[PDB]
Design a protein around this ligand. Structure first.
Ligand SMILES: O=C(O)/C=C/C(=O)O
Ligand SMILES: [Mn+2]
Ligand SMILES: [Mn+2]
Ligand SMILES: [Mn+2]
Ligand SMILES: [Mn+2]
Ligand SMILES: [Zn+2]
Length: 453
């Protein structure tokens, strides 16, 4: 009894009516799926986008992966798709001395958790993980090169993961301070035992993952509500993963047995995602897994109106951890407000709610730094500053509403939580740099209120 598989995560089979709008559907399943963190979505049976690729003209460089539980790996030779598949299939086939398509999923799972926990075995595999480029395009059809009408039906589908980010019910859309990390689909070419470590998404966003083809992808997921609980457990067993590092290029992640989590009463769910199925991860929902064999997946992050409050909670949490932000949440809120006329009216209503909190928090923060003896002030267009030039020098948060500077430490900023941390000149030498006066802010919100009624 080495491995006791976690209970199955929820599986949805939307009707074509239900399926019509992804954000509508995702909102409907949310009460269920956020209780399990991950869920699986089976498109209607005839929904099948064409995958078409030259297996010989796609090259990529693969990440080498040693399979050791609790060992630190960082988030992020040449193969064609075909050479990789030849390698992948030969590996699984030899590992089990079985026909590569005949190994039971149960067994691959059990064997995965055995080999990551045994120190004698030093199994190393290779993964491909990379964004859509001209050198490595989407597995979905994109508008250009000429498409068949089969491909054009799927060109504008909500579930084409290229359109998913930029749709109307979506929030990361009209961000202009762009991410690419979170706007653009990622492609994963898997092989047997290649894995992805426990993580949650940047800014606690949703993600959606489509397995285009090949053998299944096994997932473990934890509901967002048990996030910290999982983190406590992981802290206890692998504390060097929690040594805060100088960038998001350094955040440490690990493979860890879901049985270990279950023993400590952290709820874990599993699923085998098969070709043509979607997995959706909910905000702050931890997840990990491994591939059963040669396969091809595409994934993208996204943010709904449901998420906006969590997005603010996350940036707050990021500041306590002194973790770097991918983008400014406030800055996004204000870009939206400044486009209140062309916003979906449910979106505008939700932004207004978040903006009202932002403004009230900002009011109190400014009152506080005033009582500290910071008197001087000057407007500053923070969004013009490269991110490295507007991070709080203590908590590393990306400044947008306001910051404090000082002639004594030129170029340096702190957010208004860390006024004491800028330098040691007296606070009459400090300057409050701010994007907006409170008087600017209230009209922006009223624009949102007018749009929503
Ligand atoms: O490795 C993958 O295919 C996916 C990981 C994820 O969606 O987090
Ligand atoms: Mn096969
Ligand atoms: Mn090992
Ligand atoms: Mn993920
Ligand atoms: Mn602090
Ligand atoms: Zn700060």
């Amino acid at each position: 009894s080495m491995f006791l598989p976690p209970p199955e995560c929820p599986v949805f089979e939307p009707s074509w009516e239900e399926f019509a709008d992804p954000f509508a559907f995702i909102h409907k399943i949310r009460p269920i799926a956020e209780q399990t963190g991950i869920c699986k979505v089976r498109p209607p049976p005839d929904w099948q986008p064409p995958f078409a690729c030259d297996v010989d003209k796609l090259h990529f460089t693969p990440r080498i992966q040693r399979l050791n539980e609790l060992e630190a790996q960082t988030r992020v030779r040449d193969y064609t798709l075909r050479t990789f598949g030849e390698m992948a299939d030969a590996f699984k086939s030899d590992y089990f001395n079985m026909p590569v398509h005949m190994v039971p999923t149960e067994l691959v799972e059990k064997e995965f958790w055995r080999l990551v926990s045994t120190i004698e075995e030093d199994v190393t595999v290779e993964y491909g993980a990379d964004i859509a480029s001209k050198e490595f395009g989407s597995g979905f059809p994109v508008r250009d090169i000429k498409l068949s009408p089969e491909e054009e039906e799927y060109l504008d589908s909500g579930w084409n993961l290229n359109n998913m980010p930029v749709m109307e019910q979506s929030v990361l859309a009209h961000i202009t301070a762009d991410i690419c990390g979170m706007k653009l689909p990622w492609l994963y070419v898997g092989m047997c035992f290649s894995s992805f470590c426990w993580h949650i998404e940047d800014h606690w966003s949703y993600s959606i993952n489509y397995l285009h083809w090949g053998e299944p992808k096994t997932w473990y997921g934890v509901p967002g509500y048990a996030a910290e609980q999982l983190e406590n457990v992981m802290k206890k067993l692998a504390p060097e993963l929690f040594v805060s590092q100088p960038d998001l290029l350094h955040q440490l992640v690990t493979i860890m047995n879901p049985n270990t989590l279950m023993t400590h009463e952290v709820p874990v769910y599993r699923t085998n995602q098969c070709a043509g199925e979607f997995v959706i991860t909910f905000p702050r929902a931890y997840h990990s897994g491994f591939n059963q064999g040669f396969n091809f997946a595409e994934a993208v992050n996204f943010c709904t109106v449901d998420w906006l409050p969590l997005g603010r909670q996350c940036v707050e949490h990021y500041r306590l951890l002194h973790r770097y932000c991918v983008f400014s949440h406030d800055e996004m809120i204000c870009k939206m407000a400044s486009k209140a006329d062309v916003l979906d009216v449910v979106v505008a209503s939700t932004v207004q709610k978040d903006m009202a909190i932002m403004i009230e928090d900002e009011k109190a923060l400014r009152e506080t730094v005033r009582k500290l003896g910071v008197i001087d002030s000057e407007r500053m267009d923070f969004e013009l500053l490269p991110d490295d030039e507007r991070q709080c020098v203590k908590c590393k948060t990306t400044c947008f509403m306001s910051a404090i500077s000082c002639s004594c430490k030129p170029g340096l900023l702190v957010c208004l939580h860390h006024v004491k941390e800028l330098c040691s000149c007296p606070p009459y030498k400090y300057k409050l740099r701010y994007r907006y006066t409170l008087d600017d802010l209230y009209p922006m919100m009223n624009a949102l209120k007018l749009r929503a009624e």
